[PDB]
Paper text:
Despite a sequence identity between KpFlo11A and ScFlo11A of only 32%, their overall structures showed a high degree of similarity with an r.m.s.d. of 1.01 Å for 102 Cα atoms after superposition. The core motif of KpFlo11A, the FNIII domain, showed the highest degree of similarity (0.70 Å for 61 Cα atoms derived from the β-sheet), whereas the neck-like subdomain and the apical regions deviated from ScFlo11A. The surface of KpFlo11A exposed 6 tryptophans and nine tyrosines that cluster in two bands, which were similar but not identical to the aromatic bands of ScFlo11A. To test, whether KpFlo11A can also establish homophilic interactions, we performed SPR analysis. Similar to ScFlo11A, KpFlo11A is able to undergo homophilic interactions with a KD of 31.8 µM. We also measured possible heterophilic interactions between ScFlo11A and KpFlo11A, where we found a clearly decreased interaction with a KD of 121.1 µM. We found that KpFlo11A confers efficient single cell-cell interactions with Fmax values that were comparable to those of ScFlo11A. Similarly, KpFlo11A enabled efficient cell aggregation at the population level. We next tested heterotypic cell-cell interactions using KpFlo11A and ScFlo11A, showing clearly reduced Fmax values in comparison to the homotypic configurations.
Flo11-type adhesins are of interest in the context of kin discrimination, because Flo11 from the budding yeast Saccharomyces cerevisiae (ScFlo11) confers cell aggregation by homotypic protein-protein interaction. Moreover, Flo11 confers the formation of diverse multicellular growth forms representing cooperative communities including biofilms, invasive filaments or adhesive aggregates. The structural and mutational analysis of different Flo11A domains demonstrates that homotypic Flo11A-Flo11A interactions depend on evolutionary conserved aromatic residues, which form two bands at the Flo11A surface. By employing biophysical (SCFS), cell aggregation (QCAM) measurements and competitive biofilm assays, we demonstrate that Flo11-type domains from diverse yeasts confer efficient cell-cell adhesion at single cell level and in populations in homotypic configurations and are able to efficiently discriminate between kin and non-kin variants in heterotypic situations in vivo.
Author numbering: 13 to 20, 25 to 192
Write the structure that this text describes.
Amino acid sequence: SGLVPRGSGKTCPTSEVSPACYANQWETTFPPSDIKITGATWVQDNIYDVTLSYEAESLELENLTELKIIGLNSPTGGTKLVWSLNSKVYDIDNPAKWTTTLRVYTKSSADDCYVEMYPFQIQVDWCEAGASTDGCSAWKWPKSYDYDIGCDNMQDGVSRKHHPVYKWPKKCSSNC
Ligand code: NA
C-alpha cells in the first residue's frame, strides 16, 4: 500500500555532476568567480532542476542593483532573477556566495550516458538605480559585467567563456 503513489524526481549521483568540457585557458576578465552546478534532479523528458553555485569577489548587498541569469534555455523562462531592486526579487543574503535552483532544458552530451544544459550568462549590476553608492569609488572593476557560461566559443583548447556548463547522467541514472 504505502509504496503505491496516489496518482500520476530522481536525484543524480553527485559525483556524476561535473564540467561538460575542459580548456587550457578560460576568459579571465572581471572579478574572479567560481560558478558550477552541484546537483541535478530529473523532472521529465529533457527537463531537470539543478543547483547552481556562485562565488565571486563582490561589493556589498546594498550596492547591488541587479543579479540575474540570462539566456537560459528553460521551460520556465530565459531569465532567473536572484536580486533585483527594480523587479522586487530578493533571494540571496550575500552577493559573493549563493546558490539558486534553475529549471533547465538539456541535450545529449558527447558521451550519451550524459546530458548537459545550454550556455547562459550571469549579469551583475552595481551602484546604480537606487543602490547604495558607498564603497563604489574604491571598486576596481566595471559597475556592470557578465560571466559567460559555456562549452562553445572554444578554439584550440582556449575558451572565450569564463566557465564550462555542466553535464550529469541522463534521467539522473546510475548506469554511467
Ligand atoms: Na543565500
